[PDB]
Amino acid sequence: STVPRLHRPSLQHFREQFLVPGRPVILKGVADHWPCMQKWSLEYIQEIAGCRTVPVEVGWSQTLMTVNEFISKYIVNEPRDVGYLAQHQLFDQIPELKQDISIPDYCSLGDGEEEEITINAWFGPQGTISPLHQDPQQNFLVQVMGRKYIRLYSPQESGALYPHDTHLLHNTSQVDVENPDLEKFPKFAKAPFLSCILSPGEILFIPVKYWHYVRALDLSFSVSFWWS
Template identity: 30%
Template sequence: MVHLSSSSLPVSLAIELQKDWPYRTQLILQPPSSLWPKPRFHPFPTVKLHSLLDDEHWETAVARLDMTLIVAGAPNREETIHTLIEFIQRNYLPPSVRTSSLPAEPRNKRTKFTHDSPSEEHQLLLAPNPILSFDHAPSLSAYLNKYSQTPFIVRSHLIETGWPAICEQDSTWKDKTYLVKAVGRGRIVPVEIGGEYTSEGWGQGMVPFEQFLDRVGWGSCAAWSERYESDQEASKEPALYLAQHSLLNQFPVLRKDILLPDYVFSGPEEDVPKGYKPPSNEEALVINVWVGGNGRSSPSHTDPFYNCYAQVVGQKRIFLTPPTQSDAMYPFSSSTSSALSDSSSTESTSFTAHLLSNTSQVPIFTPDNRPPDRDTYPKFYSDALGCSLEGVLNEGDMLVMPFVLKSL
């Protein structure tokens, strides 16, 4: 039981919540009001505290509560944390979104995309084979019997199934104003800072959500892309990337904007890789979000689970290699990493020593589209490249993949 009555209420509240509180801990605001099981806040302290604290204090409180969700996960207390954030935002942080003078893209209630002959940007850059593509999703029976071991793209699947994040005018994820208003003020997100996580100088940090969207040039019209590239060149600020984050757990208000494809509940029972285990949570499901600016890429890597990869905004080029060719992709922390030992300094060797063995050393997509060096990666060319696949995901497309090495 904690009494909070000073002007440092939001900061103290957030700090205390990050500690290991008992399950039935009560927060007392005066008069006493229990947050469990049905949070109730009396309006009296609201008026009093509003006059004592400015927006910065309340945004700091929300950010500290976000840290609890991001770092610790707040087991058994997620609902309490979300309730506190909503209470602070509703009473002390009214919506305030910086608007841009850039032209907005016209939006329709239901957007339709066409996939006719591939444009120049859809041509294969490295792999000799395209990823199998369907205009309509195969049935569950066809998936389990014919395609569960084969990567494939379902064109416009998010459109056909009506994802609000891409179809609905008032909840499209293209719209920065919608995203910022939906999650509210003071929110922060974990990001990667710098280049790929295999690069020197790479780091991690927390940034305000709205600032992050600005930094990655959120929006897809030409004016946004041009401003993003010029801003990055002018400021020399390191690129930011939100990678593999449970964003919908942190911002549950966005969960209603996506729909789960049936494939995620129908994994194959046969020909499953040895030792494979589905996610261990109650739903046997993990939902992660990636957000990056123009030109952002990830090194080739493997994931522990079967994947359905939905492209909500923008485009992404994908390179896939069969898991049988893992050694030919020169994973870190393996005997094949010796391929770089002759040309690497002790410092760079120690830098890569911490990397997981699920990551490849072969640079698949580079800013200048330069292919990997043949002398450095001979097995990639002799073994892996010939059976590799490549494709481009457009807005609304979904990639379904079993275990493969992929570069995004």
């Protein structure tokens, strides 16, 4: 079913009806006028960040290149393969860019320190996929450029999601959400879920340990805030 959308909810309402019970929600009217929303574009990103080295996930492999190289090879014209500038603390690397975002006010409802919030960039072409997985903190995923299809499964459904059998990968599902092998993973079929298309200016709250799967529908840039 579709993740609910709420316009600038009060801190207390967000706390009591979403944060405490661990229910996903899309926050509207919160990040829609952050400077990033109008400023970020390929040319702006090239100008500020183009010369800096970033990690890039290819496919599968992990490599390093400049932001300019990443754009040239994996976004513009006709890329040969899928590349994704994923899960990278770009704003620690480039303080000038950090000026264009801010910490959502709702994070102050947490028990953690603002200092310790981890801010990651997620920048890539249409078609990037983050396989179904869960993270150990709360998340606000802020969509800046393009749209993403997102599937969400509650931590209560973990037994239908066939986590990998190693410590290192136990927070990742073995299932390919959009083409599941139901012969091998039959329990996946019956597990309920939420989904949405997250659009520019919107924030998705992903509760701590909620399983999420994400596919970019367009050239996309998202910023996540992992907080407690």
